[PDB]
Amino acid sequence: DSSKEVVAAMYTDAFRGATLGDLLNLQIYLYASEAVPAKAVVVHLEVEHVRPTFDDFFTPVYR
Amino acid sequence: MSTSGTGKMTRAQRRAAARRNRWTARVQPVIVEPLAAGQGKAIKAIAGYSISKWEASSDAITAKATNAMSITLPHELSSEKNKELKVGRVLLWLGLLPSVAGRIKACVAEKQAQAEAAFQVALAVADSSKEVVAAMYTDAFRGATLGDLLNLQIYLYASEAVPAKAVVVHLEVEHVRPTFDDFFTPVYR
Amino acid sequence: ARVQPVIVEPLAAGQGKAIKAIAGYSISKWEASSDAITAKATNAMSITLPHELSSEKNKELKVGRVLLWLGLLPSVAGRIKACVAEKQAQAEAAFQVALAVADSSKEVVAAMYTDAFRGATLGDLLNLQIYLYASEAVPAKAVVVHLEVEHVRPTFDDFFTPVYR
Amino acid sequence: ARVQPVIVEPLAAGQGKAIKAIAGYSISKWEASSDAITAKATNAMSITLPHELSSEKNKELKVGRVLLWLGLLPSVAGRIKACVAEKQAQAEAAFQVALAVADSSKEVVAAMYTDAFRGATLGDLLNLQIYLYASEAVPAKAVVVHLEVEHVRPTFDDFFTPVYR
Amino acid sequence: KAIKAIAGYSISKWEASSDAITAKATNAMSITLPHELSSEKNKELKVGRVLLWLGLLPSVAGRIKACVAEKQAQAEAAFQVALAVADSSKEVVAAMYTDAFRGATLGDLLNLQIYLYASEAVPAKAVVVHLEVEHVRPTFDDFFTPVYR
Amino acid sequence: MSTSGTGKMTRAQRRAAARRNRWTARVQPVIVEPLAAGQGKAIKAIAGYSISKWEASSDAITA
Numbered sequence: 055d056s057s058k059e060v061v062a063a064m065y066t067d068a069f070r071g072a073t074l075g076d077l078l079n080l081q082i083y084l085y086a087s088e089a090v091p092a093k094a095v096v097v098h099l100e101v102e103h104v105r106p107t108f109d110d111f112f113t114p115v116y117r
Numbered sequence: 118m119s120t121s122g123t124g125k126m127t128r129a130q131r132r133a134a135a136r137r138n139r140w141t142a143r144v145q146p147v148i149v150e151p152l153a154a155g156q157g158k159a160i161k162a163i164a165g166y167s168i169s170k171w172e173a174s175s176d177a178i179t180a181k182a183t184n185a186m187s188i189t190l191p192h193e194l195s196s197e198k199n200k201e202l203k204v205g206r207v208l209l210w211l212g213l214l215p216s217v218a219g220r221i222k223a224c225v226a227e228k229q230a231q232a233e234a235a236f237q238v239a240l241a242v243a244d245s246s247k248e249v250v251a252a253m254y255t256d257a258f259r260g261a262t263l264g265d266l267l268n269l270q271i272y273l274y275a276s277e278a279v280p281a282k283a284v285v286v287h288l289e290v291e292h293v294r295p296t297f298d299d300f301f302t303p304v305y306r
Numbered sequence: 307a308r309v310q311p312v313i314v315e316p317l318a319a320g321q322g323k324a325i326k327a328i329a330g331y332s333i334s335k336w337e338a339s340s341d342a343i344t345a346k347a348t349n350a351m352s353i354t355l356p357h358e359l360s361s362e363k364n365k366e367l368k369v370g371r372v373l374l375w376l377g378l379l380p381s382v383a384g385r386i387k388a389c390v391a392e393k394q395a396q397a398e399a400a401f402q403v404a405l406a407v408a409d410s411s412k413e414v415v416a417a418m419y420t421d422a423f424r425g426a427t428l429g430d431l432l433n434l435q436i437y438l439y440a441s442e443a444v445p446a447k448a449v450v451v452h453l454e455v456e457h458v459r460p461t462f463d464d465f466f467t468p469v470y471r
Numbered sequence: 472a473r474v475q476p477v478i479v480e481p482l483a484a485g486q487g488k489a490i491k492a493i494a495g496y497s498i499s500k501w502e503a504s505s506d507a508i509t510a511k512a513t514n515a516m517s518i519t520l521p522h523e524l525s526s527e528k529n530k531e532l533k534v535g536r537v538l539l540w541l542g543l544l545p546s547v548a549g550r551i552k553a554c555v556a557e558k559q560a561q562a563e564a565a566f567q568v569a570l571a572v573a574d575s576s577k578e579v580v581a582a583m584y585t586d587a588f589r590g591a592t593l594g595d596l597l598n599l600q601i602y603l604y605a606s607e608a609v610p611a612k613a614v615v616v617h618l619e620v621e622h623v624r625p626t627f628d629d630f631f632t633p634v635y636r
Numbered sequence: 637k638a639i640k641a642i643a644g645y646s647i648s649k650w651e652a653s654s655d656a657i658t659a660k661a662t663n664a665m666s667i668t669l670p671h672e673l674s675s676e677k678n679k680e681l682k683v684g685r686v687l688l689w690l691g692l693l694p695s696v697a698g699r700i701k702a703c704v705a706e707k708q709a710q711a712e713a714a715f716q717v718a719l720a721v722a723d724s725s726k727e728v729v730a731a732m733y734t735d736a737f738r739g740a741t742l743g744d745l746l747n748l749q750i751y752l753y754a755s756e757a758v759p760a761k762a763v764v765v766h767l768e769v770e771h772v773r774p775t776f777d778d779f780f781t782p783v784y785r
Numbered sequence: 786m787s788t789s790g791t792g793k794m795t796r797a798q799r800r801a802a803a804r805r806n807r808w809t810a811r812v813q814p815v816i817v818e819p820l821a822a823g824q825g826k827a828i829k830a831i832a833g834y835s836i837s838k839w840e841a842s843s844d845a846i847t848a
């Protein structure tokens with residue numbers, strides 16, 4: 055909520071556990087009191103998910 | 118007696134005394150296993166070091182000429198706080214179309230004045246003729262502004278002129294792991 | 307470090323190279339027969355998954371190591387390369403990015419997708435494809451590709467089904 | 472002596488082959504850019520020694536192991552061999568007697584002059600030459616040769632020089 | 637009565653030939669850094685105290701000076717902010733930039749020219765200038781290159 | 786001192802302290818022996834197992 059001091063929502067355990075793809079089918083909603091332009095605002099999504107394995111090791115030299 | 122020196126009936130045997138003869142050390146047999154595609158080895162990064170990779174699509178290359186491309190990083194590590202980050206050993210390899218015109222090579226060195234000159238000096242070189250189409254810049258670039266790299270292009274040569282997007286090239290690069298990966302964001306902004 | 311007087315022993319087709327499978331993770335394979343391919347072009351078939359493991363029960367499984375080798379007639383027309391990637395938008399684009407790739411100019415014509423797919427739904431594969439390119443054009447069934455994959459054992463081979471419901 | 476089931480791992484350009492230097496003996500290198508060479512003929516350049524170590528102080532030094540590899544444009548014209556000997560009277564005569572010789576048909580295009588010059592004045596080199604031959608004629612700067620040598624550290628990097636004499 | 641470098645610190649020096657100049661005017665020259673250290677690798681190394689001095693023909697014009705500072709917008713003004721300066725009138729034709737740069741990217745200096753003024757106009761290669769610079773010795777220093785290229 | 790570090794007269798020597806550098810494990814040299822015809826290997830059968838062999842003459846094969 056914008057009216058609130060904290061312009062954000064916490065989905066703690068709300069979505070804990072779910073195909074890191076499941077999420078795709080599931081949109082996000084935004085309402086405005088006064089009509090408004092595009093790129094008029096962004097929105098970030100800090101999401102917890104199991105760390106992958108790429109982050110580490112390189113790549114098989116032998117392909 | 119010695120090897121299968123087990124027979125029937127009598128049968129004496131003697132040798133001779135001298136200064137030996139056979140080699141000093143003795144043999145060991147082996148069997149080189151046949152390895153298939155990808156079985157190779159993707160050595161894991163190191164301590165507190167991430168390996169960020171990604172590719173860049175090719176540019177229409179000509180006859181025997183060799184192009185270049187200031188390589189640029191992705192938005193994530195494109196932070197002034199991470200720009201001044203350190204790097205480790207790093208490698209480049211390349212995925213390309215099956216139907217390939219001639220054989221070709223590629224490397225990387227400081228924003229070369231002369232584009233072809235690169236191949237006369239780079240530590241390693243991804244050669245197509247070779248079984249390993251990639252180069253290892255181990256310690257070659259260890260330690261360096263994770264931005265430094267920007268000013269420093271990559272070079273590619275082709276025997277037969279060729280189209281663009283005709284081939285990509287990945288860059289597995291070791292660099293200190295950032296801090297974003299973990300913790301969320303200050304709710305209070 | 308005195309040198310080691312060694313001796314490479316000769317390896318004869320189909321010898322050694324035993325490939326142990328992982329625990330709990332059972333490996334199951336099969337193959338898709340090629341469809342005629344043109345010269346230098348590269349076809350692609352969605353994963354020819356076997357019905358044996360189509361049940362959403364097991365179809366909702368995971369994988370790991372995945373082999374891929376091929377059988378081609380002795381009358382093999384020149385050479386060909388093969389691999390697999392994510393429903394590649396561009397056909398030939400697959401070869402520009404797979405971890406492995408079987409080739410006919412290789413002693414061992416096969417590709418090992420070592421963990422590269424580890425932890426992926428058994429169903430998750432069908433949105434994958436297998437890509438094969440050939441030097442000179444050629445017929446179909448002309449070549450067979452063998453998707454050798456390992457994953458797990460479910461809850462069926464275990465037993466039959468309902469006598470009286 | 473049961474056989475050893477082994478496995479040659481694939482080596483990718485610029486991998487391993489770390490070459491530790493000896494103690495006290497510091498290694499310093501550089502390179503001379505080729506001058507146009509004709510077809511099959513072999514040029515030769517006196518040692519292109521660097522001024523950095525021209526001081527009679529350090530010029531009167533000694534050496535040991537000495538590498539020599541080369542960089543050539545991708546558009547490499549056929550093949551070429553290179554080496555170094557005592558101000559060879561005959562140019563091609565050098566190849567008939569050097570301990571090592573880098574070649575373009577070798578996996579590793581470089582030559583290792585292992586101790587072959589150990590204990591020689593750093594100056595003692597200039598009365599040496601580097602010889603390079605080419606299959607077909609070719610331009611200058613067309614190739615660069617890298618004299619990688621090891622010797623010792625002197626008495627200068629150590630510090631600056633006279634503030635007030 | 638001599639001088640010393642620092643721990644694990646090398647002193648790389650070299651000179652740069654003068655480009656002829658006009659009288660009273662003062663030229664500048666970005667730094668002709670040594671290739672060996674132009675590698676972003678060590679190019680991003682740490683420097684120590686550093687000094688500049690200058691060898692010049694005997695037969696030379698009126699006493700002139702020279703220094704070094706950040707890419708100075710005003711060539712002449714670089715001498716008002718100069719930390720030390722090599723004066724010819726002085727018995728010491730050199731400047732000591734001790735701790736003045738102690739601790740800076742070996743590639744930093746690049747974005748930082750050198751300034752020289754002259755009483756009487758003068759020829760090119762008419763005078764050189766050496767730069768004895770402290771910087772941490774790098775790695776390779778004592779080990780060959782992988783033959784496998 | 787280390788390798789042939791035996792000379793004449795004095796001559797001090799010092800190094801530097803850091804985080805080492807050289808590879809972790811060290812080298813082993815070898816020499817692949819050249820094998821001739823038949824030297825190979827005719828692995829012996831196994832327990833209570835015979836190895837029956839024999840050949841079959843070819844048939845005129847085509848193109």
Ligand SMILES: [Mg+2]
Pocket residue numbers: 073366427
């Ligand atoms: Mg699912």
Ligand SMILES: [Mg+2]
Pocket residue numbers: 201262741
């Ligand atoms: Mg910086």
